[PDB]
Subunit: 131 residues, 3 copies
Amino acid sequence: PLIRIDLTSDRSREQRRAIADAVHDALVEVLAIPARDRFQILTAHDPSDIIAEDAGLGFQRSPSVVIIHVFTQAGRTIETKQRVFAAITESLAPIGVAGSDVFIAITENAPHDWSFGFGSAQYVTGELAIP
Amino acid sequence: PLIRIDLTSDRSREQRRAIADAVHDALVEVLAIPARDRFQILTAHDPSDIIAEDAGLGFQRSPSVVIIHVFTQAGRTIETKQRVFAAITESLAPIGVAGSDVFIAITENAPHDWSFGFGSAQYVTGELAIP
Amino acid sequence: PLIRIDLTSDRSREQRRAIADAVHDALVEVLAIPARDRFQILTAHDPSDIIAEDAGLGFQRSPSVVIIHVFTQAGRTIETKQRVFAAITESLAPIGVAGSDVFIAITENAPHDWSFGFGSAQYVTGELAIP
């Protein structure tokens, strides 16, 4: 999967990488993807450029929101997705991201929508196995 | 829905916020989503890093382009999507964004593809109602 | 299509622009979209903010990775996509992007999910021809 992580500049570079390592670890744990199946883009913003309210659920976030947008091939069940959300958030708590401050989205495509390099579609050529 | 707003750094922080407010008000109006269902990432770029032509439709833009990418759950009609486009653009006109300079894309997923916080899938658990 | 190109800040503005030209030419060649059907967002990051390993395929990348995310209408066949992946990658080699540092993903929607300006959905009204 390709993960876009958008967070705020008040967080140190060290914590940004901890955040990314945690998100990856969680995905490996729950999806059982190769440990080197890691593709992430981290973008830091001024806090005012991320606006994430509470959807009417009655809680408050700090300004240090972390938005995690997972682009991944279809196939995973609802329950597997619930576990993804849980593991990501649980992995982040001990490195300093509160549960209230994490927002996660999943967007799906097919195995034939990926190229990992060299102009090749490795799921189509079978150079990479499909989960 | 999760809205990525990509615009140009020459716009002031106030006009940036106004643009975000306008997109949000437009979606509330047309989609009848909760007022606090507001999730937005604004990213400012140097004007040269956004390239948006006309697809051969026969018009020109200024460099102050605003690209709006709406990630929302499936289920809205074609006609409703048109009302969204129209509303977003109309709302942005008085804020200093010309019709020529707006570009909007919609990418869909399902309700189970969302976590609004706390590592929970609120639509799946029933904590939030699915429109 | 809307193309998000994320790359690293070591690359010059000239090369960034040549990369964007290359990707667009490849897409015109393979997809046969109008020459001015060009919509791209180019974002430069600290090298440490883009992490792209090898999916366990047994190669190394330079830190100067280029991620290309194509958001486009559904309909293109598996082979057309394979052709896109290849055209893009070979277009970039001469301008200085090694085939090991290119990662491409495609995420699909429908013709009624686009507005090219003026609050109108041009594929739906007929003003723009469906590819």
